[PDB]
């Protein structure tokens, strides 16, 4: 049947390295009373693009 899914299960853990290389800042905004919201204050560091490496 073409309407199911094929579940493959490996022998070898093929690595993958994922990263988000930003130093991001947490800016707290008080939606008072007492409730506080964490926004993206800013981004510092090597502004690469978030990604993942895999041994071809």
């Amino acid at each position: 049947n073409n309407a199911k899914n094929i579940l493959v299960q490996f022998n070898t853990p093929v690595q993958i390295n994922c990263t988000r290389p930003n130093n991001n800042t947490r800016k707290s905004i008080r939606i008072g009373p007492g409730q506080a919201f964490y926004a993206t204050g800013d981004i510092i560091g090597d502004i690469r693009q978030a990604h993942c490496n895999v041994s071809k």
Partner: antibody
Amino acid sequence: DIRIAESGGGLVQPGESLRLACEIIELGFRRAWTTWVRQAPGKGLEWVADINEDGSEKKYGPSVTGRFTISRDNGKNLVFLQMNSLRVEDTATYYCAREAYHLVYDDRIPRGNWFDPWGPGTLVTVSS
Amino acid sequence: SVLTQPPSVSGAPGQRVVISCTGSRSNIGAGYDVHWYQQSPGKVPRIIIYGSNSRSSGVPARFSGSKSGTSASLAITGLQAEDEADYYCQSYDTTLTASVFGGGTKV
């Protein structure tokens, strides 16, 4: 923060070694590469030797190529420029700084580096 | 490892002055920035122009760097005695050295 403390010079005669130490306190000591730059008394800029925050990597300038061994105490958080074979040819004063384009590095390759912090420098006069 | 820093920049007080701290394929042709350093007579120099074109604090817009291919030059307008001071550029070498320096320059 940035509170640097230069020291370590000596009033000596040629043919010896000496220990230099910048101290910066109340901040990441192992959180910024620092470098070394002298000034012949009436002359310009002369980079001496670089270091990692951990000192894992170090490179030295041509003038003192492989003659002054730079390193640093990490846990006590001191830097130790063990200069060796001191000679009159290097009569100058010395200064200590570090580079900080860091905030946002927009590349795979850097635009360079800076020299932001300054201080008293040190006194070296190795001669008779 | 020397930048073509003019041994003397000139300009009557208030006049515009320009300094062409240029290098080679290796330093400004290399792709880095001309991190100039302003020095006062008798005082330690400091950063006046980083990023080769960017101002820091306390530096009037009269003072601005620029990098054009293999050339790197600074601009000062309204030059005055508080501005009649030393300037020393420095950047990266692709050939042999870390920190190329110009010869220095004062008014």
